[PDB]
Design a protein around this motif. Structure first.
Motif, PDB file in Angstrom:
ATOM      1  N   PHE A 138       0.804  -1.278   0.000  1.00  0.00           N
ATOM      2  CA  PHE A 138       0.000   0.000   0.000  1.00  0.00           C
ATOM      3  C   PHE A 138       0.821   1.305   0.000  1.00  0.00           C
ATOM      4  N   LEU A 139       0.186   2.435   0.366  1.00  0.00           N
ATOM      5  CA  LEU A 139       0.914   3.754   0.392  1.00  0.00           C
ATOM      6  C   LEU A 139       0.432   5.079   1.129  1.00  0.00           C
ATOM      7  N   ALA A 140       0.598   5.191   2.455  1.00  0.00           N
ATOM      8  CA  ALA A 140       0.196   6.395   3.211  1.00  0.00           C
ATOM      9  C   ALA A 140       0.777   7.639   2.541  1.00  0.00           C
ATOM     10  N   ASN A 141      -0.014   8.722   2.518  1.00  0.00           N
ATOM     11  CA  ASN A 141       0.392  10.029   1.919  1.00  0.00           C
ATOM     12  C   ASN A 141      -0.098  11.296   2.744  1.00  0.00           C
ATOM     13  N   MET A 142       0.131  12.550   2.284  1.00  0.00           N
ATOM     14  CA  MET A 142      -0.438  13.717   3.049  1.00  0.00           C
ATOM     15  C   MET A 142      -1.951  14.098   2.728  1.00  0.00           C
ATOM     16  N   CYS A 163       1.064   0.764  17.623  1.00  0.00           N
ATOM     17  CA  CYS A 163       2.197   0.610  16.752  1.00  0.00           C
ATOM     18  C   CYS A 163       2.211  -0.911  16.437  1.00  0.00           C
ATOM     19  N   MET A 164       3.392  -1.500  16.617  1.00  0.00           N
ATOM     20  CA  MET A 164       3.665  -2.930  16.428  1.00  0.00           C
ATOM     21  C   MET A 164       3.461  -3.738  17.731  1.00  0.00           C
ATOM     22  N   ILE A 165       4.187  -4.870  17.838  1.00  0.00           N
ATOM     23  CA  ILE A 165       4.152  -5.747  19.025  1.00  0.00           C
ATOM     24  C   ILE A 165       5.210  -6.844  18.841  1.00  0.00           C
ATOM     25  N   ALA A 166       6.037  -7.048  19.882  1.00  0.00           N
ATOM     26  CA  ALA A 166       7.112  -8.078  19.906  1.00  0.00           C
ATOM     27  C   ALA A 166       7.339  -8.836  21.273  1.00  0.00           C
ATOM     28  N   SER A 167       8.312  -9.769  21.294  1.00  0.00           N
ATOM     29  CA  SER A 167       8.620 -10.577  22.467  1.00  0.00           C
ATOM     30  C   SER A 167      10.001 -11.044  22.835  1.00  0.00           C
ATOM     31  N   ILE A 177      -2.821   6.795  13.321  1.00  0.00           N
ATOM     32  CA  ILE A 177      -2.102   7.957  13.761  1.00  0.00           C
ATOM     33  C   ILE A 177      -0.632   7.530  13.753  1.00  0.00           C
ATOM     34  N   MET A 178      -0.425   6.220  13.644  1.00  0.00           N
ATOM     35  CA  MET A 178       0.937   5.749  13.715  1.00  0.00           C
ATOM     36  C   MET A 178       1.849   5.693  12.483  1.00  0.00           C
ATOM     37  N   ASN A 179       1.437   5.091  11.369  1.00  0.00           N
ATOM     38  CA  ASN A 179       2.365   5.144  10.238  1.00  0.00           C
ATOM     39  C   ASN A 179       2.340   6.599  10.023  1.00  0.00           C
ATOM     40  N   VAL A 180       1.258   7.266  10.418  1.00  0.00           N
ATOM     41  CA  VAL A 180       1.239   8.694  10.287  1.00  0.00           C
ATOM     42  C   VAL A 180       2.506   9.205  11.008  1.00  0.00           C
ATOM     43  N   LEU A 181       2.851   8.576  12.135  1.00  0.00           N
ATOM     44  CA  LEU A 181       4.095   8.878  12.885  1.00  0.00           C
ATOM     45  C   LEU A 181       5.280   8.563  11.934  1.00  0.00           C
ATOM     46  N   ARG A 182       5.262   7.295  11.495  1.00  0.00           N
ATOM     47  CA  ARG A 182       6.235   6.666  10.568  1.00  0.00           C
ATOM     48  C   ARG A 182       6.414   7.549   9.356  1.00  0.00           C
ATOM     49  N   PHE A 227       4.411   0.421   2.902  1.00  0.00           N
ATOM     50  CA  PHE A 227       3.325   0.636   3.845  1.00  0.00           C
ATOM     51  C   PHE A 227       2.164  -0.263   3.473  1.00  0.00           C
ATOM     52  N   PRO A 228       2.384  -1.578   3.344  1.00  0.00           N
ATOM     53  CA  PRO A 228       1.380  -2.565   2.999  1.00  0.00           C
ATOM     54  C   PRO A 228       0.959  -3.056   4.370  1.00  0.00           C
ATOM     55  N   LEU A 229       0.362  -4.241   4.461  1.00  0.00           N
ATOM     56  CA  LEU A 229       0.017  -4.596   5.813  1.00  0.00           C
ATOM     57  C   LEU A 229       0.498  -5.894   6.416  1.00  0.00           C
TER      58      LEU A 229
END
Lengths: 189, 369, 189, 189, 189, 158, 159
Positions: free
Chosen positions: B227-231, C14-18, C56-61, C180-182
């Motif tokens: 995919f692809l986040a943008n502004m 965000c993510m999650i790990a161990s 709001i997060m990849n938004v961070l990214r 930014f795929p999933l």
């Protein structure tokens, strides 16, 4: 939980004592004075009311007419008795005389480890001209104390008392005064 | 002779009002081809890296004068002849991440424009690298490594003469740079983001078309299960469904030799293109020209004055499709008199008071657009 | 104590790990990014930065110029290791780079069971025009991260990250963007 | 620590259920609805959604258009499994559908004994005319639920749900209604 | 209980040290300086005052005239000593000199695991022109410190100090200055 | 050359020095304001030189083509004249640089502009000499400090 | 975008009022020695030949803007210390003939000035190559090959 953060203000105390011998017997509790004068409990004490002479405090000890906020507290000391090789409760019961009659003013929680505090306040006030004192014969009185438990001595070494001379403190006192020398501090880290 | 001219007319600061040519200092042929793979990048350089050493009217100031504060403006003289039109876009966004992306839904959206490889004479796009406000020193995009571009989407279906790579000219202008931002308190007048979503590969003949499509909005967009986040898409959400008069910008990146007329609006994306009389929803539309081509939109609350979702989940439906959007219907009998195929643009600069609220705890499934 | 009551607001992560193998070695700690981009620690990771693609997060990214309140947090996952057949500390140390030079910005408590959180905030801000970014060459920078411990892996399975896009968030960004795929959600209750 | 004191307001709930057989298998978790209608999880339930018919609550169950503050909570029940012969975590994850896609809205702590609560709020809101509902076909929806763990059933007998009909509650609803008879209270102290 | 949520502000520290050998003897406690200059305790130290050179902090170290809020704190580090194979108390006692005379200003709780903090404040102030300093010969002084316990070393590895340069900080200082080179950070996760 | 980084105090053989012009004078991260220095002729009325003073880019090594290429201010000493100051604001840099650094900060990745000087004139003495030039910060023109620096040091060899 | 900007703010003519530094574009160290033969030329270059390629404030106009019309001004920051003064002169005259001459009674006299290698701070001399009037295009001294200088006569007897 533990978001212990931004704590504050200033704090003075009083004396300091401990839950006793080994030698020693069955579950008791320290019942001493919550402010001034005769400052010790009854019966098998030998806890040693290691009396300190605090600032705002003997001021307590020497404050007849007494108006003004305090934020009394407690905290305890024990030993290398594993959190599991442990069980150290207590429940505060401060009042104004204490007896097989009376009914204690307040109470307070705990039940865990050594260094377990408590910190609050007793809206001081008074009768004649809104201020009071140690069962002083005018109409009658009662006074401050607290019942600092002891339901297991090989659980808790010491007991900690502390007092807060607040702003709402319209004091007075200069009571008729005997010994105020010192017993300050032995520092054995 | 002697003089404490150490100040005089010497301390050279000048935010410069050179004539847009006494300002001009660029020289790079904008690439242009035929045997081409749909989206065709005619480059993606840099700001300062761009070149080092370019003899022009504004000269020493590139790295001298200190700061200025207008918009780094461009005009690239192009054209060809008469036969068919086409789409192109210049990339300008922010810095970079790693081995990134290269498209019109990508490289542009920070601040952008939209043009045709044969329209009358030229396109305009006044680049001011700082969104935060205005004024500027040499670094801000340098040591903040942004790179720019130029490319189609559509194209002149009729591939022509040669590979006319024109000229990319800029420097600046004395314009009142507008400091772009987007108010968290969601419901708002106007809207900034831009949103890339045009074109529509249309056959010749008159295949009884109506190539629907939603108007869902959110994050960015796909690529083969990628995919692809943008502004124009993500802060432009957070909230759940979106609610406002936004409007698009279509264009004739197609033909003055091939036409078509396609409505644009809000009906119901749960009606497959074969409706009895599809021209049955509160209209607005095409009727292209050799001259005319760029078009916009306008669809509000007298119209939909009720919520639809700036979001979706890869398993959202039609035969259980909530909300109305722009899912178009032709009208006219499509043409070319040759070997062609039509198209149609789509975009979101600024709304009419947009209601955003709520949030979406999460999914994705970047709708194949 | 537990007067857990009236909690509130909205929260994304965000993510999650161990905390890792068995197979596995001696006490380490996960030191990953606190906001965007390169989001993994160093050395014997194999913790699997199970990257999620939050709102709001990849938004961070994907937020280059970055102004606006966040209320980061942590919480942990363990196992059927009796409260006594337990000991699971950690102490946060988020900073702006982390190294045999540097000095971490902040720290934070714990030491008990699996699901033990933390939740707060870092007054974001910035230089040029009051906003900043990932060691971006203009004058110089640093950036957000956090040192999420690991002083016992057969004590703590997972680590939990979360982020709060606040009102004081004068953002920007649209950084130059790769994948930014999933990788959304596997639900194995 | 424990200065549990002055707690307050009014509180209604919902149903009540429990972490299962003995007979029984490997770690699961109850994933039921956070408001109305289909109120049960999936797979090996047999937890018995002992559905109660609460006031403000079936009102929830029967509140189509739904605007208005709630202060949901949880708390758990276990047994005579010594604080040491214990380990009873959980971590909330309420969201709006839950699946091998989705991404849960929120989460929440614990890891200790039986009666371990939680209490907060979800700013309800909505789309059409600012209010919403159970994946109701207009534009699309999602709805409230919560993932109330179960990573050890011979650790936790019951799960407790509760809901707060606040002032900011601009309700509506009267949904098209099937069974609302009762299953009130069996009192086995 | 644990509604750890919305924590906040910014925080700098000082140095960092630890409760000692094995080899080693009978219960002691670290009694170092609470602000500047001579920063170590007395007797069998060998705790290694791993001095760091913090921002607002050497600023402390180098702040003669000193007016301005601080939010000192502590937190501790231990080991893989099961919550039951544990008992790790402490009780703060910060004052202005400390001795077989004196009387410590304040105190503070704990008694559990490794990472157990504390965080508060000391309304700084002063004499001459309302500001003070390290027993500086004008009328006389005292200064800041704290008694960070040690009643069991095979219980607690490290001790953590931290300081908050607040707004109410009407500083001064530039004291006559010897070594301020560095000892920043060794990062052994 | 030389920067204009500001922070804490200064070195000595892998040893440093916090002072009053440097540390409360930070806390925040980068610093932002028209401060200005005070140069002087602690050198010669028999040896001169003229050296600019300003803000260009400390990522350009002294051998530039025409170094006198950044928004100027400068020397031209005297037997009499000598003490000099400065003045460098926001028409000028109206954008952040770091009142701090880490012993491993760079030039071929050097952020921000500062005073890294260039002579002009053909240096002299008619004897056996060598020139010099002062630097100082009494009071700015509205200084923007904010942010903080959780820590490093590495007291820049100045 | 589209625009007949073919005029706009583009036809760049400007007789330029750059600040005498937004005008500055030179970079050549004026020679200076001791073991010296009385009249000591510290060079004699050209106008346009001078150099080709000099990164400065007024830049493209050297060969761009078309014409201007002020005086090609100079100020060379010099000095030394205190002991002795001296003479110097810059050469500026017309074109050339053949293997010509190089002195203060020669190279200068067209338009000139007179300075000392240690006087307070600097000398001035605003060169306008055309005597005939004023205004100027790139050629007039180029394709009219004049060359300029700098040199003593006197000197600081104290070397």
């Amino acid at each position: 939980g533990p978001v212990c953060a931004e704590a504050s203000d200033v704090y003075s105390p009083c004396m300091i004592a401990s839950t006793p011998p080994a030698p020693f017997s069955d579950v008791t509790a320290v019942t001493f004075d919550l402010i001034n004068g005769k400052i010790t409990p009854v019966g098998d004490d030998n806890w040693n009311t290691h009396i300190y002479n605090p600032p705002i405090m003997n001021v307590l000890r020497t404050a007849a007419w007494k108006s003004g906020t305090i934020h009394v507290q407690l905290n305890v000391r024990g030993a290398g008795v594993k959190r599991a090789d442990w069980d150290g409760q207590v429940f505060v019961y401060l009042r104004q005389s204490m007896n097989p009659e009376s009914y204690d003013a307040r109470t307070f929680v705990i039940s865990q480890p050594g260094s377990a505090m408590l910190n609050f306040s007793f809206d001081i006030i008074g009768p004649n001209s809104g201020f009071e004192f140690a069962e002083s014969p005018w109409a009658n009185q009662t006074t401050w104390y607290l019942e600092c438990v002891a339901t297991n001595p090989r659980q808790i070494q010491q007991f900690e008392v502390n007092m807060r001379f607040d702003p709402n403190f319209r004091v007075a006192g200069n009571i008729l005064m005997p010994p105020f020398p010192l017993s300050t501090e032995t520092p054995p880290l | 002779m002697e003089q404490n001219l150490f100040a005089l007319s010497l301390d050279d600061t000048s935010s410069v009002r050179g004539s847009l040519l006494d300002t001009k200092f660029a020289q790079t042929r904008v690439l242009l081809s035929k045997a081409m793979a749909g989206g065709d990048v005619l480059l993606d350089e840099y700001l300062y890296d761009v070149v080092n050493g370019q003899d022009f009217r504004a000269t020493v100031a590139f790295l001298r004068t200190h700061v200025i504060t207008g918009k780094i403006k461009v005009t690239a003289t192009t054209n060809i002849s008469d036969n068919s039109g086409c789409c192109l876009m210049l990339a300008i966004n922010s810095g970079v991440r790693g081995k990134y992306s290269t498209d019109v839904y990508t490289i542009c959206s920070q601040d952008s424009m939209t043009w045709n490889p044969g329209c009358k004479k030229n396109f305009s796009f006044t680049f001011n690298p700082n969104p935060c406000g205005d004024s500027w020193s040499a670094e801000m995009i340098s040591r903040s490594r942004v790179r720019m571009t130029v490319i189609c989407v559509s194209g002149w279906t009729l591939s022509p003469t040669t590979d006319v790579i024109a000229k990319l000219d800029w420097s600046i202008v004395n314009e009142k740079c507008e400091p772009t931002i987007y108010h968290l308190a969601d419901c708002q007048n106007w809207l900034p983001l831009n949103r890339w979503m045009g074109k529509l590969t249309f056959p010749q003949g008159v295949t009884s078309e109506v190539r629907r499509m939603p108007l869902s909005i959110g994050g960015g967009a796909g690529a083969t299960q990628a995919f692809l986040a943008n502004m124009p898409n993500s802060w432009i959400s957070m909230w759940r469904y979106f609610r406002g008069e936004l409007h698009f910008e279509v264009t004739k990146m197609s033909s003055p030799y091939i036409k078509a007329t396609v409505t644009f609006l809000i009906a119901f994306g749960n009606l497959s293109d074969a409706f009895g009389f599809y021209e049955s929803f509160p209209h607005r539309i095409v009727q292209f020209a050799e001259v005319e081509e760029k078009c916009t939109l306008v669809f509000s609350q007298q119209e939909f004055v009720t919520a639809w979702s700036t979001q979706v989940n890869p398993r959202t439906t039609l035969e259980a499709d909530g909300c109305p959007y722009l899912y178009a219907i032709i009208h006219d009998s499509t043409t070319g008199t040759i070997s062609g195929d039509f198209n149609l643009g789509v975009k979101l600069v600024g709304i009419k008071d947009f209601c955003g609220i709520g949030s979406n705890p999460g999914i994705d499934g970047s709708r194949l657009l």
